[PDB]
């Protein structure tokens, strides 16, 4: 009769022990999977950090490429001014010769020598002018080329914007999940511990029941 | 005697429950974060792949910019060749002029006006030469700028490759935690449900005892 109610207690102890035994098993198996990424996770945080330097290096490189193109632009702007100076010299030479010829013809036979020479100085001037306009042509292609370069570089910066943003969001996410994990692990330990201690206190009490 | 054990059991059960009840409350709130974390994970994964395709575009664009710089190269060399041509013409004009002065010397004062013109035809020749030397100085600094930017673009090209790689690893690891979170959520979900069932039964049996005997 009294021994009858004893079997209930011992039974109840078996219920407690089985539960705590399973809570311990499950939480330890869970801690394991968590922990087995806490290595793979570190390489990643180290990788993002290094990735940031690369971003920074790229952002500057693009900046350098730009100011550099701006340089040849300045250089082209000068070749253009300088070539126009050659063009002017060519034209100043041209009328002196032309007018020299006119005067040459004014004089008799002697003029012929000069007249022949003046005639060639002219053709050489008109030939010079020609080379000038050809150089100007290549100057305008270099201008066109540069513009396309800069625009291509701005197309690079715009697209690289998202690359910077997404990596920052990665570091952020990473910090928060590490934290999430810690709280999980932390809640399983604290819980397992107090629950195991509880069943220990229950089992002891039960040992007393059967003991006497 | 049964009583001291009976009260001990109740008290312990009562506390036992409070702790189990507390685990459930914490478990639920973690499960709420996990679910909110799975979604965020889904977006960061989309952003990653968009960056992956963006980088691919830049990879192709830099190849283009190098072609543009290379074309300026062709042009600038084409200028130097034309500049030499002008220079030759200047030398030729100079002796033509020098020969004129020298032949205007030979023909009295009947031509001491062709001396004047011949003299500045010479002066303009030398002017052309000076100018041209500055065009070369300038034309070389462009090649110096061109090469320097072809090198900067090469280091850029490879720099975008390391970024493309890193992005591919990020995707790897993202897919890899999306998995980890899912497992943890599943693990809590079932552990909460069976803890509730098992503990409910031990709570019921305790009360059955507490009243009898």
- Kindly report the name of the CATH homologous superfamily of chain A: Methyl-accepting chemotaxis protein
Strand coverage percent of chain A: under 5%
The CATH class of chain A turns out to be: Mainly Alpha
> How do the helices and strands follow one another from N- to C-terminus of chain A?
HHH
Can you give the helix content of chain A as a percent range? over 70%
Report the biggest beta sheet of chain A as strand number plus sense, adding barrel if it closes. Answer: none
Per CATH, the architecture of chain A is Orthogonal Bundle
Rg of chain A (CA only)? 46 Å
Specify the overall morphology of chain A: rod-shaped
What kind of assembly state do the chains in view correspond to?
homodimer
PDB class: signaling protein
Keywords: four-helix bundle, methyl-accepting chemotaxis protein, signaling protein
Assembly: dimeric
Entry title: Crystal structure of a Soluble Chemoreceptor from Thermotoga maritima Asn217Ile mutant
């Amino acid at each position: 009769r009294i021994e009858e109610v004893k079997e209930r207690f011992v039974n109840l102890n078996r219920l407690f022990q089985e539960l705590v035994g399973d809570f311990q098993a499950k939480s330890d198996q869970l801690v394991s999977v968590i922990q087995d990424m806490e290595k793979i996770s570190e390489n990643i945080m180290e990788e993002l950090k290094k990735s940031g330097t690369n971003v920074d290096q790229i952002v500057e490189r693009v900046k350098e490429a730009s100011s550099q193109i701006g340089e040849t632009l300045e250089n082209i702007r000068s070749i253009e001014k300088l070539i126009q100076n050659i063009m002017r010299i060519a034209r100043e030479t041209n009328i002196l010769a032309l007018n020299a010829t006119i005067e040459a013809a004014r004089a008799g036979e002697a003029g012929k020598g000069f007249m022949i020479v003046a005639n060639e100085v002219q053709n050489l001037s008109n030939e010079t002018n020609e080379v000038t306009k050809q150089i100007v042509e290549k100057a305008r292609e270099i201008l066109e080329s540069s513009q396309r370069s800069l625009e291509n570089l701005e197309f690079m910066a715009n697209l690289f914007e998202t690359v910077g943003k997404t990596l920052q969001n990665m570091v952020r996410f990473m910090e928060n999940i590490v934290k999430l994990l810690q709280e999980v692990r932390n809640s399983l330990d604290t819980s397992k511990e107090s629950l195991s201690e509880k069943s220990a206190e229950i089992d002891s009490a039960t040992k007393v029941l059967e003991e006497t």
